């Protein structure tokens, strides 16, 4: 029930600026310092700044002084980060975390991270296709099938099986990038006779183009 | 700035055995008030980092006694007593004694389970895609171990080198295994003036390629 809850995922033109928000629920907002960390994707974390919501007090890393500017809304417990003057290099995952005020005892509970993709490109919405098991099957031991989310920009896309309830058995792969656009794939291994029998639908969301698709894996 | 340092960069470890990550700092991490504030964090693949130990040695809530922190002044080491599958991840050490708060590099804890061999599944191009001017043969090499696996596609008995597009998973939390997608994307037509498709993996579990294969003359 202590939840720090972040803004989403954004595609930004270079030169533009962004307000990522971090929204707190469940705890006393002002009893804890909110800290913002950057992360470029396959690497270490770095600190970006500190805001104390109750007093308005902001401190920053010198690498971020004047890029980052932290602001908080007391009226409705959100803290913000405005990144000014964007460039290729700001594409990263930006978290926020809570730090207790009366006593440092670690960065307690972190949000989900806003993924911010800085680029000159145009969004393109993904065309989902159902990946259905071949003919000589429905047997051995278990059953495989999948989802192909082809043709898209920017990452993120979100795949789901039977809206979350088909949760054991998946394998969502890291989306690779072919010519300026992404191909995300994903598989599931059902029991050798439960998919024909009862039911499976790939659910995909491309939040950055508002595209949502429900495609059911159907036998050929 | 308090140059943080972790070693190893990667740590191959087996289920049940001990594991010991180590982190050392350029400055003394003990802040005037008398407290060493070095914290250790876990970032499972894809999740966001979670706190493991907070002032050097004291564990955060609901955190198995297998984990223990320890150290002094500039030298702190972290220990996992009998490694489990759920400890897959990168471990970060960080200091909050000195602004800027700095983090370590991260050590990649790799589980070292007994081998496994892939469950190769060919997928012919769906009929929604073949309507739209292109077709894609998709393949999923699943639940394998160890990660060096090799995939070769062959269209009608010959090797194809193009529009091949591999994606690789991260070692699995609950069962320590790797996985892989391999996608071949053709035009509609170069799909259609060929009848055979073959996805073949090379490994250690089998000396022969784990060939799966299907034929365009689907009906």
């Amino acid at each position: 029930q202590v939840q720090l809850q972040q803004s989403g995922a954004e595609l930004v033109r270079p030169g533009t600026s962004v307000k990522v928000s971090c929204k707190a629920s469940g705890y006393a907002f002002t009893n804890y310092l909110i800290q913002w960390i950057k992360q470029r994707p396959g690497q270490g974390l770095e600190w970006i700044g500190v805001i104390n919501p109750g007093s308005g007090g902001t401190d920053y890393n010198a690498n971020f002084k004047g890029k980052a500017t932290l602001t908080a809304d007391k009226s409705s417990s959100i803290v913000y980060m405005q990144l000014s003057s964007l460039t290729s290099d700001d594409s990263a995952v930006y978290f926020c975390a809570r730090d207790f005020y009366d006593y440092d005892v670690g960065f307690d509970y972190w949000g989900q991270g806003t993924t911010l993709t800085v680029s000159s490109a145009k969004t393109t919405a993904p065309s989902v296709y159902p990946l259905a098991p071949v003919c000589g099957d429905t047997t051995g031991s278990s059953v495989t099938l999948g989802c192909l989310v082809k043709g898209y920009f920017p990452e993120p896309v979100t795949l789901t099986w039977n809206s979350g309830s088909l949760s054991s058995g998946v394998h969502t792969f890291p989306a690779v990038l072919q010519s300026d656009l992404y191909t995300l794939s994903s598989s599931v291994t059902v029991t050798s006779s439960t998919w024909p029998s009862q039911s499976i639908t790939c659910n995909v969301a491309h939040p950055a183009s508002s595209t949502k698709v429900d495609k059911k894996i159907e036998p050929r | 700035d308090v140059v943080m340092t972790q070693t190893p960069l990667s740590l191959p470890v087996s289920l049940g055995d001990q594991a010991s990550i180590s982190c050392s700092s350029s400055q003394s991490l003990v802040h005037s008030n008398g407290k060493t504030y070095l914290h250790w964090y876990l970032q499972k693949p894809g999740q966001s980092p979670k706190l493991l130990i907070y002032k050097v040695s004291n564990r955060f809530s609901g955190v198995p006694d297998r984990f223990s922190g320890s150290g002094s002044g500039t030298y702190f080491t972290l220990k996992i007593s009998r490694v489990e599958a759920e400890d897959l991840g990168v471990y970060f050490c960080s200091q909050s004694t000195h602004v800027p708060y700095t983090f370590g590099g991260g050590t990649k804890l790799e589980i070292k389970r007994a081998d496994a061999a892939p469950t190769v599944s060919i997928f012919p191009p769906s009929s929604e895609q073949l309507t739209s001017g292109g077709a894609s043969v998709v393949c999923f090499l699943n639940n394998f171990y160890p990660k060096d696996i090799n995939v070769k596609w062959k269209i009608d008995g010959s090797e194809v080198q193009n529009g091949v597009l591999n994606s690789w998973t991260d070692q699995d939390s609950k069962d320590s295994t790797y996985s892989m997608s391999s996608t071949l994307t053709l035009t509609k037509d170069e799909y259609e003036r060929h009848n055979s498709y073959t996805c073949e993996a090379t490994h250690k579990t089998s000396t022969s390629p784990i060939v799966k294969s299907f034929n365009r003359n689907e009906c």
Partner: peptide, 11 residues
């Protein structure tokens, strides 16, 4: 002893 909001009282 006591300087800023940004810092834990602790420290």
């Amino acid at each position: 002893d006591n300087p800023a909001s940004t810092t834990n009282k602790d420290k």
